Each structure stands twice: as C-alpha cells, then as structure tokens.
Design a protein around this ligand. Structure first.
Ligand SMILES: NC(=O)c1ccc[n+]([C@@H]2O[C@H](COP(=O)([O-])OP(=O)(O)OC[C@H]3O[C@@H](n4cnc5c(N)ncnc54)[C@H](O)[C@@H]3O)[C@@H](O)[C@H]2O)c1
Ligand SMILES: NC(=O)c1ccc[n+]([C@@H]2O[C@H](COP(=O)([O-])OP(=O)(O)OC[C@H]3O[C@@H](n4cnc5c(N)ncnc54)[C@H](O)[C@@H]3O)[C@@H](O)[C@H]2O)c1
Ligand SMILES: NC(=O)c1ccc[n+]([C@@H]2O[C@H](COP(=O)([O-])OP(=O)(O)OC[C@H]3O[C@@H](n4cnc5c(N)ncnc54)[C@H](O)[C@@H]3O)[C@@H](O)[C@H]2O)c1
Lengths: 553, 553, 553
C-alpha cells in the first residue's frame, strides 16, 4: 500500500541475505535509502524531496527485496518507476539492476500528467538518488555546497578563506547547507533568512553557529571573527532585498556574494521588501498578481545590489534560483554580468571529469570509511583542500545509516581510488565490500538547461543524448546498477540524468569492471564538454589519452 | 534640460512686459505656476500632481516667455505639450493662447508610451492647471475638498463633524489642502505623508496644524482633540500603504477614510511599501518597470485596507487619484465597492454649474483680493455658507504667489461676479486687471469615468465630446487662453478635459467676452448634466434661460 | 427613430431657408450628405462606412434642421455625436456650428463600449466627413487614390505615366477606386480580385475597363496598351498571393506595385493560396484558426513578391492594409523595406501644406464648379498635373448631389483660391455662395499612427495635440463650422482628427475669415511636420514666413 509502520535499515557485516555481493549491494543500498537516520519519510517510502521514493509502493518494495534476494549473478532485474517488472538473462559483467524512473514522453512530461498516472498507480518520482538507491543523507548537499565555496576560493583566493566571509540568503531545504559549507571551507558567513523558524531549525541542528540581534550586531560579529581567523556562520533575521542594498550603501565588502532565496517562485518563495511573512502569505491568497509583482520588483533591487558588489570586484554568483532572469525582465539589463555557480565554478571542474565521487561501507563500520579516507589522502598527497575536507568530515559530518563519504575527484583518479578500495577489500583491510557511486549531477550524466547545462558555450544546453549514452556505456562497462531518471531537481520536463553504482568485492573481475567504469563514467563528462569546445576538457582528453574521434582523430 | 537653479516669480503692479494685458496675463500666470511659494518642484518645472509641468523643458519655457512678450492682440500662440510651436493670425476677441497638452491617440494613451515620448523630448504632462497656467497653490482645491467633507458630514453624520476625524494621505500641492479642508469642515484629521519636506511645506503655508512623533502619538492626539470638540489637523511621516493596514489590524475606526497620494502615476507619485523616497526616485531612473510594479502592488494593499474600513461601516471614498483603478488592475476585484467623491457628494453642485471658480490679482496686492471678497458678499448677500467660506478663507487660507481666491459659484453668478470685477478694474477700485479661471475639474469641462463623470445616471461616463465642445466654445466666446488636456487627475488614458482663463482688464471689449464666456462655460456643464437627465440641471437650464434644443426646444 | 422612408436633398438656388448663408451652408451640406445620389444608406442617416452617420437618429436630425433654420449669426450650435445639445452666444466671426462626434475617454475607446453606448441612444460614429457634413460622394476616394499614383509618377517617372502600368489587387469598397485612379493618372493597370462579383460591379460602373481571361492574356493586353500609350484598366480574376510570385518568377516588371486586399482581416478578407472563395468562407466557420494561419502564411508569400519587385527598382508601397505587419509576424524580417503610401508619397506633400482642398457650389449648378475649375487653372497656371486633373474631372467624374470639386493645393495658394472664389460670389460670377472644406485627412488635422502619421521621423506618431490645436485655431480664425472626431478610417481607439468648412458668401467679412482660416489650416500642417524635423516643412515655413517660435525664433 502507501503507508507502513516499520523501520528499515541495511543489513550489516559480512553475512549475505542475497546470493552474492553483486546483489547484496543494491539490496543494502535500497534499505539504506529508507533508514530512519537517512530518509525524510520512509514509512511512505519517501527518501527526500517530499515525494522522491525508493519504490513505487509497499507491494513493489516487498517484491524488489524478494527478487534481489533470489537474483542470480547472470540475471538482471528491471525496475520501472519503482516497480520490479522483469528479470532477464544477461551475465555477471552486466548490471544486476537496470532502473528507469519517472520518464515521460516529452509532450506529456509535466506534473499534471504525472499526477494523472500517479492516481492510476503508474507513477513514482525518483528524484536523483531516491529511486536509484545511493542516497546518503545530508552529506550530499553539504559536501556539494562546500565544493562551490572551495572552488570559488581556489579560483579567486588561492584556497585561502581564513579571515574571509560569504554573504548569502536563504536557510531552506538547500540554502540551509550554506552556513555549514562556508564554515567547513574555512570562511565566516552572514546568512539572511526571513523566517525565524528556519533560523531556529538551523541553529538547533548546528548548521548555523549564531544569530545576530540586528544588522549592526551581525557586522560587528563578522569583523570580530574574521579578524580572529575564525570560521563562524551568522544568521540574521531579515530580507536580503533590504539588507544587501543597505550593505552596498554602507560600503560593506564581503568576499563572496550569492543567494538561495526561492526567487524561482515569486508567489511563495520570495518575500517582498517591506513585507512581513505574515503579510506575504495572507496576500498570496487574496491578491496573487500583486504579490508576484512586489516580489519581482524586490528581486530587481536585490540583483542591482549583487551587481554593485561585483563592480567592487567581489566574486558574485547566482546559485540556481533564477533571480537574474527575474531581474532582467524588470529592466536590470546587465543582470547576467555575474555568472551562475555552475558555469563559473562547477563546469571547469566537470571539464576535467572532476565530480562528486561517492562511496559507502556495506559493513556499516565507520572505521572502513576512515580507512578509505586515509587511502584517499595517501593516493592524492599534494592536494591540501581534499585533505581538509576529509579531516573535518570525520570531525563535523555525522554518518547517517551506512557510513559513506563524498569527495570530488576527476578523470584518472577515480579509477585509481576504486582499484585501491577494491585491493583493500581483497586484503581484508576493509571488513566488507564497498560501493562506489555518485549523485546524478556529474560531468557526463545530466542534461538540465536551467541548471547543470545552462549556457553551454555552443548552445547545446538541451541535448540529452549524453546522459543516455552515459547509462548505456556504464551498462556495457560493468556497473552493478545503472539508472535513467527524468525530472530530478528541477521537476517534470526539465532534466534527464543517469546514475551508476559499482561494488568493489576484492575480485579481479570487479577490478576489471571498476577500471572501465571509473574511467568511462568521468570520461563521458570530459567528452561531453570537449564536444562543446571547452579548452580545459579538450586538454584533459589529450592528457588522459581519451579516444574522441572528432577531436583526437 | 528639465532642471534650472532659478526662482521664477510673476511680475507685479501695473508695468507691462508684454504688449497688452491680454498677453501679460498668461505670462504672469505661467510664472506664478512656478513661484517657489506656489509650485511643488519648480526648478524641475513641476507644479503639482506627480510630474504636472508648466512647460516641456527650460528651452521651451524661455521661448514661451519670449513669444508671449512679443505676441500681438490679433495673434494666437499655439502651445503643444508645453512647447511654443506656432503663432497665427486671429483677432482680439479670440484667445491669445491655445494649449493642448498630453493628448495621445487612445490606443497609445498610457504612461509607458508617454514616458517613451518624454525620453525623446516629445512630451509633457499638463495635469489640469499645471500646463494651462491657472494653479494657485493648495487654495485651488481647498473648497472642493471642504465641500466634499461637509457633504459627507451631512449624509453620514447629521451635518456635524465636531468630534469626528478623517484619515487620509498625501500632503502634496493638492493633497496638502486636505488637513485644512477637514479643519474648516469641523473635523480633526490624520494625514499621512512620506516626505518630510512636504509636511514642512504644508506647515509653512498653514495648511496643517502639527506633526505627530509616531502613529501611537497621532492616535492619542486624535482621541483627545475629538473628545474636546476641536478641529486640528495632524501630519504623520510615513507610508499610507503601511499605516492603513496597521490601523485596520488595531481595530481603529476613523469617521471618514480617503486618499490623495499621486496614485495616478505609479512611477512618480506613489511610494512603495518599505521604500524610502530617495530609493524610489533613484530606482525610477534605472528600473522603472520594477518601480511601477512595486507601487501598484502597494496600492493594492492600500485599497484593501480602505475596503476593510468601508466594510466596518466607515464612510470611504476615492478622492480623485485613480487609486481604485490601479488596485483593480492588480487583482482587487472589488476596488470600486467604494465610490468616487463626485457621484457620492459633489454632482448636485455640478448640476448647477457650481465648481472651482477662481480669480487672481495680477497686481500682486492682497487688498485686491479682499476687495473682491467684499464685492462677492455684496452681490451674493444671502448665502450664509458662501459668506462663511469667505470669512474662513480670509482667516485661514494663506496667499501663495499672486493673491488669489477660490469661490464655488455656478451658472448666473460667475458672469455676475466677472462683470463686477471688470467694472472694479475700470473704476480703479482694483489696482490692476484680474484673471478669472477654474480647475479643469468643473461641470462642463471634463470626462473621467473614475472621477468627475463616474456613474452618470444615463451611463454616459466615457463620452468625451463634452470637454472638446467646451474648449471650442470658450475659443468662440473669447476666453484669453483655452486648453485641452488629456490625463489630468487620474493619469494617462483616463480623462480628457478643457481649461479656460479670461482677463478682466476693465474694457467694454472684455466685458462683452466676459458676459458670454462666463455664461457659456458653466452653461456647458448644466447642459451636459441636463443631457444625462439630471432634474437639477434641467431646472437650472430653464431658470437661466439656456437654449438646449433637445430639452427647451 | 432609426429609419425614415424619405428622400433628402440640399435646397438649391439663392432662396434661404435659414437666416443667413452662414447658417444656410451647414444646413445644405447636412442635407447633401443624405442625398440619394451621395449617401450609402440615408434612410437610416448613413452617409458612408455602413454606420457613418449625419445625425444620431431622426429626432436629432429634425432638431438640427429646425435649430439651424432659426440660428442667429451671433449664436453657435453645439453638436455632440449627432445631437443638437446647446446653443450659445458667440459672434458672427466664430463658427455657427461646433461638432464633436464619437469621442471617448481613451481607456474606453473601443467598439465594445461604443456599442454599449449606441444601445443606450448615446452614440454616433461620425467617420470623417459623415458627421461633419462635407462628404461629396466617391470623388474623395477616386481623387485621393489618383493623387497617390500621380505623386509616385512625379517622384519616379518625371510626372508622366504614359506607357506605364500599376500592378495591384482588391476591387473592394476602397480598392475599387484603384483602376479608375490609375487610368485618370494616365497609367494602365492590372487589378487582381478574387471575387468575380466584385469585378462584375466595377466593370458595370466603368471603374474597370475590361477583364482578361487569364494571366497570359492580361500580360499581352498590358504590353499592347502601354506600347500604344493608352491608359486602360484590366481586371484579373485570381489570387494576388499566387499571381504576384508568378510575375516575379516570369521576370515581369510593373511600374508600380501596391495592394488593397483586406489583409487586416485574415479570417474574412484575405483568400489563402490554393483555396477557392467558397472553401475560404466554409472553412472560416469550422476551422477559423487554421484559416487565419493559411491567410497569414499566404500574406508572407505575397509580401515576399512585393519585396522582390522593390529589389528590382519597382516603386512598391503598402496601401494601409496591414499586410507588411502580417508578413513580419511570419518571419519576413524585411517586410518594412517598402514604405506605406503616406510616408512615401503623401507626407512630402503634407510638408508643404499640400492637401485635399475641396469645395461645393451651394447653388446646385454645375456651371459654378466649372467656373471655379477655370479660375483655379488661371491662378495656378504652371502646374500641368493640376490642369490635367481638372480637365479629367469634368469628363470622367460625375457630380453627386451638389456639384463639388477636390484639388490638392498647399500653403499660400489655398487662401489665394478662397479669396478668389469669394470675389466671384460678390461679383455674381458664381450664382450663389460656395463652401470650402476638406476631408479630415490633411496635413495638420489628423493623428493616426497606423495610417497618416505612421513612422513620423521623430517617433511622434501618436501625438494628438495637433488636430485639437487645428480645431481650436479654426474656431479662433473664423471657420463656419469646425469638427473634432475620433476613430475615423481606422476605428475606435486609433485616430483623432479635425474638420473645418468655411462659406464664401462674397462679403468683406468672409474674406477676412477666409484669409485667416485658409492660411492657418494648412499652416498648422507645415508646423506639425516642421516640428517633426522634416526639411521640406521647415523650408516651406521659412518661404511662407510662418511664425514657428522654436524654428524661426
Ligand atoms: N542549481 C542548484 O543546484 C541549486 C542548489 C541550491 C539551491 N538552488 C536554488 O536555491 C533556491 C532555494 O532552494 P531551497 O530548496 O533552499 O528553497 P526553499 O524554498 O526551501 O528556501 C528558500 C528560503 O528563502 C527564504 N527567503 C525567501 N525570501 C527571502 C528574502 N527576501 N530574504 C531572505 N530570505 C528569504 C525563505 O524563507 C526560505 O527559507 C531555489 O531556487 C533552488 O532552486 C539551486
Ligand atoms: N479630487 C480632486 O479634485 C483632485 C484635484 C487635483 C488633483 N487631484 C489628484 O490628487 C493627487 C495628489 O495631487 P498633489 O498635487 O498633491 O500631488 P503631488 O505629487 O504633489 O503629491 C503627492 C504626495 O503623495 C505623497 N505620497 C506618495 N505615496 C505615498 C504613500 N505611499 N504614503 C504617504 N504619502 C505618499 C508624496 O510624498 C507626495 O507628497 C493626484 O493624483 C492628483 O491628480 C485630485
Ligand atoms: N490607409 C488608407 O487610407 C487606405 C486606403 C485604401 C485602402 N486601405 C486598406 O486597403 C484594404 C482594402 O479596403 P477595402 O475597403 O477595399 O476592403 P474590401 O474588403 O472591400 O476589399 C478587399 C478586396 O480584397 C479581395 N481579396 C481578398 N483576398 C484576395 C486575394 N488573395 N487576392 C485578390 N483579391 C483578394 C476581396 O475579394 C475584396 O474585394 C483595407 O485594409 C483598407 O484599410 C487603406
């Protein structure tokens, strides 16, 4: 059915429930997706995003578990929007599970039709990692936001963020990660949020350190903590469209400026200048046209302030909330004089196949992750920023469900790491096999013109051949499970993306798959960006000896 | 350019700059429109009502002055949106100046197109009396506002406003008359104004009594003064769109609610919620589309509060700034649930041709006006209301620029007074010629479905043949200058209206023009309302012996 | 009352019904507007355009006639949308009648509101000359279309069209005038029309000389008639969007290309390529959206052919049917590479105040018009095109109602001719007074951004100050009747325009008014165009000694 009063947790240790580690792995990771410590609403099979599910319904979940438990190494289960629809003969070097969730023929790819199918029992929103069984809790968004701040810090500031501060807004579902990410990057931050209840939540969870009493107090604290070389996040109850222009007027100069207000939704996600929250919600019901106009006017003012910071040379960037387009429509003709965070910071990383390399210890032992943390530092010895992340993840990131880790590593190094992990399983240094996967947001695995593929230099934003080729190639290469999803992050109609996870069980046959998959997966991202004509990606392909017929011959 | 750091003042006494009194008169009244004691912002050519200007720019101003100085009595100057465009041969019994300001082919009659033309040097907003040179400071409207308050008192409060108070906003050139009008009607008043300089101006010219320190203070004063039976006006520095909703929330109940902010022009005349006046003016230059959106959204909130007051039983009306229209456009579907002041209170006066009839002493002598006050009482000896009006005017209305007088009289009496004043000029009782005019708000000179012709009994609100005929007839009859303006009062798209001024220079020739012009001008108003089937107007036409073919034969 | 089974004709000879010739003139011209020989549907007071009326209804007509009959020379009648609303004292040098028809406050200036008012007995569409009593039948449109073709000939072909041919389409209400106008101008013409019934009509009335059997036949006839120096009009039954592209393909070069299909109305007025008229009418009922697209697509093809002609040096012009706009919306990005006929040909004439000078013999005698024709020839002896037109008019243009004539005459000559006609009345050369007027389409008397003021060089298309000033100035100057109309030609919302008519009764007093009015009326046109910065207008202003303060000091 829809609701079940149960607690689900991944089996631990070395005892198998399934027939091998190739099938035990997806089984454990599915169950991990539903862990009370990991999942948002697992009693309704919700992993995250309110309706991002691990399985279509409880009958489907039961049958997936049943089927995985008896699946042979020469068989492949097909999961179709969270339903186990078929088992077919393949071989041990093919994936054990092939997953396609939420895919709709384009003309019908909208929430209205999704809802119609849902009513008929035909639907499940997979988000990214909800339906594809590789979600590891808040570490994803925390590490991800950390990467943006750290990369911006590498580009502008030589990786030296001590005594520097980030100015931003929004402490919501995604924005709440900003203060912690900044702190971990080594920066102070001032975080503007219009709902006190969201500040309270982020204070309670220690994502934000302190709340200032007012703007003057906020600035005193920032000046204090930066002078002392501390990395402390500060929350301020207020309105970014009021505070940012005031900071410009006062000549206050932050070291980075961004924003995570929900400016994509003027009716519901962006408080107009001068309004309480309060007035905003009340007026949204009675005069929605006026509210949208008030919010949009306020965004123009907000973006003018962001542009003013950039004119003073402050690294300034959009954090995917559509605020620049909103402002532009209001006559801020130069709204796009500051870039989106992906084109500015993430894409150059994607050009080198650097993306969010994610792994989990199937044993459940924290020590297995600590051992892999140490291995990563050993194999990548000269990279100080990676070492800092791994040092403070142990100190400041709590495991949720199965101990897991994310770090950003590129073409060449992904395979090096995966093979080392595999050798560690073989040697018994790791107590049980590990899985290596990622979010669906990687260099060669996503098409999303409003986000990850916005403003491709060749205008190819909407080309979705790439994630489809990525999934086909990872199937051919030997990933343990491969996923194709639609509409993760941005909703029905707006993205297509692929996932893969591979088990490292210490065998040489795994090593062969690992070598292929962990070369090919980032390799497709280098290819994709080289195809668009990015010099970094072309140079990376040549350095790594990638075979790109139209570039390398 | 539209800024010049100069003080403009009407020449005084009997020495002529122009060739005759027919040409000296418009020269002096143009300059009087720009007198620092008269105009809201004369260094930018702005007289009142948002950006109501006296001339298109300073080059145009200079050329108008130059041209009027050389104009012959058989010549007519054409003024086109504040620009002197042509001089043509007519005769001494035709107007010396013909003015057409702000007129746009209907499909293009909106603020967006006006602003485009303005940016090209092709436009000027005439308002009503700004572009047609018959503005006399806050006195021009003060009797109208007074008659409105008094009539509302008759309908709602048994003819007594003692112990009652008005809530309103806008202390600009015309809005500044509200506090004094309320006082003269016997009511206390709370008047919200966003610019300290405007409060200062009203304080300086004795139009408002005092300024409260905050809203709480204002409310205690209102409660005390009303309990004492006093009639004292109170200015409060703030934003009506913030204060009115707050007052609704607190359950505060004024005895009347209206508004006279410059809502007719969202870009220039109405301060958005949460904005300073400085931010408003700066942003109007850079992001005008956002500014209009913010102002209109704020008007929606403002009108919602006015509607809440009305639902609580508070007498509520639109005082002629088109605010209901602006709110309706933004989703306030019931914006017109409260009426305009004309259909509610003033129309029966228009039916008799009674309106904002006025005159000014070109000599600059206060004693010339006092002499006219005395003559009016002599000629209208039995009207207690009018005698008291004139007493209160002498006691409480400060002259601004050239001494002038507002005095609401209708068909029959306008010519009687006009002819008496001309005799006083001939006899030397008046030291120099006087000009007789009116606002364009008058019985026969305006079509405006959201103001002067709102809810006509025959549904003829939008018929604008009438003001055009009025201007043509005033030209045929021998007014000294005649105007046809678009958009005065209620903004672009919403009105068409005419103006007239006639000089009483003491001659027999002027007497003949005065006799017919001051009969015909209110005569067209009686005709217009008689056409619509108003019995008061029909009875008035018959009493005065008007020739109305479809009514009298 | 709406319908009256009567025949109305202007009184003839020298016997007065009214009190003077100043009031006899408008009376006769009103009745002439309803002559069975002149009016489209006079039993319902319709002069032209289906609903362009002389008076609002029969009661109004009766009262207008009765009032004019008793009107004194020092009195002025106000006509308000065809209704005699008031009579006021003026003087003998003011107009006897002031007319304002169809004027609506801009926000309500649309047909839906007009219709609402009409249903309440409050409305009348005056068109241009229907409500202002100066319509003289088909001579207006025939002469006007003639002037376009003649002016094009002057600009491109040294003022000779002999051996030349015009290619156009549309033989409708206005388009039907094309073949006759081309013939009179001295050119051959090929006229494409999709309805055989329309061709039949024009063949019967001799507007079109002959019908070709097919395109090849048409081309054989054109080659022959042009080679023989004949001016013969040829109709071709077909589709302009099929024929014009075929002519381009064949390498055929006409000497002028224009179009008067009803492209402004894709659903009803423009036959799609490959469709029969029956298919078009049938499909308009079942699939109107598809019909509109087929027609719009066909317009794109048609305009492509017109551009192909222009690229070859063929004088090509839009004849006010919106076709360029329609094609542009379909991806013909250079659709405005050919001009409208006004900007190209009529506007240069307007710059010199050259416009359609029209006059009528109140006597009813054809000899009166023939005498004035000869007088015009005498006073303008060196203009061969003028002489040709007047000779052409006598032989090819039939009088309708009162004998009347149109001539294009500019600043300086208009007054010269008017003073001369007046002297002929005085001397008894003319058997009775003549009226001098015009269409509302003259240099200083119309604002109409989609027609006569399209693409003003300064962007002032929509400025309607000008016709208003023209009306006011003609009232001041001494025209016999003056009119302000809205919506003529282009409909509610899209134009504002003025009329004037002046009687030449042979008196010295009329001469004084004629010298003024006939200088001032075209003078305002030169002024308007000089204001816009047209060198021709500025040069003309200086040559005629016009007093334009911002140009000449
Ligand atoms: N492109 C990406 O990968 C990416 C990553 C992170 C966030 N985002 C974007 O950031 C936006 C926020 O995401 P979210 O999930 O946190 O949304 P959310 O709705 O949970 O959070 C928005 C927060 O902004 C606050 N807010 C609204 N108006 C404000 C104002 N004027 N001043 C201060 N605070 C205000 C709201 O109270 C809310 O807490 C979204 O548009 C999201 O798409 C995009
Ligand atoms: N009813 C009538 O007879 C009549 C006559 C003349 C003018 N008017 C109309 O009256 C209005 C005011 O004319 P004016 O000459 O005073 O204009 P103005 O532009 O001189 O003054 C407008 C005033 O409104 C104040 N204001 C604007 N927004 C405000 C807000 N949100 N809260 C508080 N104050 C605010 C401004 O600071 C300014 O002082 C105009 O719309 C004008 O067209 C009506
Ligand atoms: N701007 C001006 O002053 C001016 C002057 C003359 C005409 N016009 C414009 O010209 C157009 C015609 O006016 P009208 O009153 O004659 O309209 P109308 O509807 O009477 O005539 C249009 C004619 O076009 C014919 N037609 C339609 N599609 C055709 C096609 N594909 N091929 C050949 N013939 C086709 C119709 O059969 C009809 O006879 C209108 O848009 C009018 O506004 C403007």
């Amino acid at each position: 059915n829809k609701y079940r009063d149960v607690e689900i947790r991944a089996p631990r240790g070395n005892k198998l429930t399934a027939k091998s580690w190739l099938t035990e792995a997806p089984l454990r990771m599915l169950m991990n997706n539903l862990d009370p410590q990991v999942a948002e609403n697992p009693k309704e099979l919700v992993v995250y995003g309110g309706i991002g599910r691990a399985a279509r319904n409880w009958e489907c979940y039961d049958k997936i578990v049943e089927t995985l438990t008896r699946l042979e190494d020469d068989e492949t289960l097909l999961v179709q929007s969270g339903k186990p629809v078929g088992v077919f003969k393949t071989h041990s070097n093919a994936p054990r599970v092939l997953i396609a969730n939420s895919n709709l023929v384009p003309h019908w790819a909208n929430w209205e039709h999704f809802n119609e199918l849902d009513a008929k029992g035909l639907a499940m929103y997979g988000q990214m990692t909800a339906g594809s069984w590789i979600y590891i809790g808040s570490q994803g968004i925390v590490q991800g936001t950390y990467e943006t701040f750290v990369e911006a810090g590498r580009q502008h500031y030589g990786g030296s963020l001590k005594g520097k501060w980030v100015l931003t807004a929004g402490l919501g579902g995604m924005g709440g990660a900003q203060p912690l990410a900044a702190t971990l990057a080594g920066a102070c931050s001032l975080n503007i949020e219009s709902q006190q209840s969201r500040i309270d939540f982020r204070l309670e969870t220690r994502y934000v350190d302190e709340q200032a009493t007012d703007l003057d107090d906020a600035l005193v604290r920032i000046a204090k903590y930066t002078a002392e070389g501390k990395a402390i996040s500060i929350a301020l109850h207020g309105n970014a469209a009021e505070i940012l222009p005031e900071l410009v007027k006062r000549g206050v100069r932050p070291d980075m400026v961004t924003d995570q207000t929900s400016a994509h939704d003027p009716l519901n996600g962006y408080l107009p200048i001068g309004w309480t929250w309060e007035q905003y919600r009340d007026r949204a019901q009675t005069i929605p046209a006026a509210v949208v106009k008030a919010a949009k006017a306020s965004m123009a003012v907000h973006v003018q302030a962001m542009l003013d910071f950039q004119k003073q040379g402050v690294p300034t960037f959009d954090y995917g909330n559509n605020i620049r387009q909103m402002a532009k429509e209001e006559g801020v003709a130069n709204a796009f004089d500051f870039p989106g965070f992906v084109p500015a910071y993430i894409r150059p990383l994607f050009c080198r196949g650097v993306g969010p390399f994610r792994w989990a210890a199937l044993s459940g032992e924290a020590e297995d992750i600590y051992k892999t943390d140490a291995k990563v530092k050993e194999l990548i010895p000269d990279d100080a920023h990676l070492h800092r992340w791994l040092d403070m993840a142990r100190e400041r990131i709590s495991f949720q469900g199965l101990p897991a880790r994310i770090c950003w590593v590129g073409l060449g190094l992904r395979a090096k790491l995966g093979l080392a992990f595999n050798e560690m399983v073989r040697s018994g240094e790791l107590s049980a096999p590990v899985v290596i996967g990622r979010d669906h947001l990687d260099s060669g695995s996503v098409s999303s013109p409003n986000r990850e593929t916005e403003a491709m230099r060749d205008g190819s934003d909407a080309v979705s051949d790439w994630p489809l080729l990525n999934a086909l190639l990872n199937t051919a290469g030997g990933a343990t499970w491969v996923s194709l999803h639609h509409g993760g992050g941005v909703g029905m109609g707006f993205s297509q993306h692929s996932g893969m996870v591979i088990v490292c069980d210490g065998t040489d046959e795994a090593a062969e798959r690992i070598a292929r998959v962990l070369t090919n997966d980032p390799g497709t991202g280098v290819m994709r960006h080289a195809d668009a004509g990015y010099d970094i990606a072309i140079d990376c392909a040549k350095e790594q000896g990638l075979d790109l017929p139209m570039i390398t011959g």
